[PDB]
Structure formats: structure tokens, C-alpha cells
């Protein structure tokens, strides 16, 4: 999914 969140968690 390209629209998945791109940031650290």
C-alpha cells in the first residue's frame, strides 16, 4: 500500500 503511513512509530 503506497498510502500507508511513511514515518517512524
Amino acid at each position, epitope marked *: 500500500n*503506497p*498510502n500507508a*503511513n511513511p*514515518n*517512524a512509530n
Partner: antibody
Amino acid sequence: QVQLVESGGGVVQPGRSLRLSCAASGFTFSSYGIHWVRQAPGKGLEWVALIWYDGSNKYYADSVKGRFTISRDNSKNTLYLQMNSLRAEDTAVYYCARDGGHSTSWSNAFDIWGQGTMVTVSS
Amino acid sequence: DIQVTQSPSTLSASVGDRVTITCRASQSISSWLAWYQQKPGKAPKLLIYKASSLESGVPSRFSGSGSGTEFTLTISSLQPDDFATYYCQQYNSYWTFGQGTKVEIKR
């Protein structure tokens, strides 16, 4: 203060290569996914590519796939866009833009933008 | 591919006027729509995210509405620095922006 600074733009001949970069300061760069977005003279905004915070997942627009490569060096707080086989229609201001991080369960609108770097593809 | 089209392409208005601009997605984007303001030769500025959420520090005269395929951006009363081009962007399937609505000074 949070800031994104693009560099590398200049006159480059068609068919040649150019490596843009985007240097971040004022925030934890290694925590954020970052996009490249471009705007051709007189035209609208066109998303180019996304890289994840750790440089793992990379997404490209169909117009640049196979010619452009996104990468990052978190130790230098820097993002790159290697452009190969440049065409005249790649002439544009190139922006780096941060995922806003409003929500952790989806990607977000682009909150922080750089000033842009102008790439002119001409012989 | 999801397309987003804005209407109108140019809007003429005066300071103090209210302006509502529209953005239509070719298929449902749920609430994943953002509004940006761009002045000529300047970096875009985020105004609204998730259809109606106001980005921090953006003046309260900007409001967004809509879901699914029909969305709108309203400026309650235009200020002199609001003359600009406005772009909507869907972040549901990849990233696509609209063609922009130029808000221009009427005379």
C-alpha cells in the same frame, strides 16, 4: 526552526543525469517519510516520489519510473533524487515535502515544503 | 488512477467577499483530501488536511467540507494576501493534485 533546502538544480542537457538533494534541519529527519514534488513552468503540481523514514519503501510516479531513483542518508539528514535520461519535459522546480504525520494509521498531507530547486533540461 | 478536478479554474473576487471552490474526485477518496495555497514562484502551503481539519497556524477564515467525491474549500472573507492559486490533493490512492483555482482580484 524546521526547514527543508533543495539543491542541485541547474541547466542539464537532455539524456544526461543529475542528482538533486534536500537537506533538513530543525526536526528529526530520520523519523519522517519525504516526497519529491515538481511543478513545470506554468503548470500544476505533480507528485514524483516517496521514500519511507528508513529508506525502505519507495514509490514513484509513472512519468518518472525507471529513470528517477529516490534515496536518503539519515546520517547527513539528506534526501536525494537521482534523475537519469532527462527529457525536456522534466524541466521543473523540484520540491521536497514532508509527510505531515497528522495520523499514524495513514499517510498524510504535506506540511513542510522546501523553497524548490529549478532544473532546466536544455542543450 | 484517481483524478481530482477543481472548479472553477479562475475565480474573480474582492477583499471581504466569500469564496467557495470545489474539488471532485473521479472515485471515492474517503476523507483523504488536502487543500494547499500557492503564490507564484513560492512553495505550496498546507491549509486543510483530512477534508475539514485546519492545519496549525492557518487562519480560521479557511474551512473545508466534503467526503467521498465532492469537496469544497471556503474562505469566509477574503483578505488581501489570499489572492493566490489553490490546489486540492487526494492522498487515498497515490498522490494526485487538481489543476488549481486561481483566486484573482476583481476590478
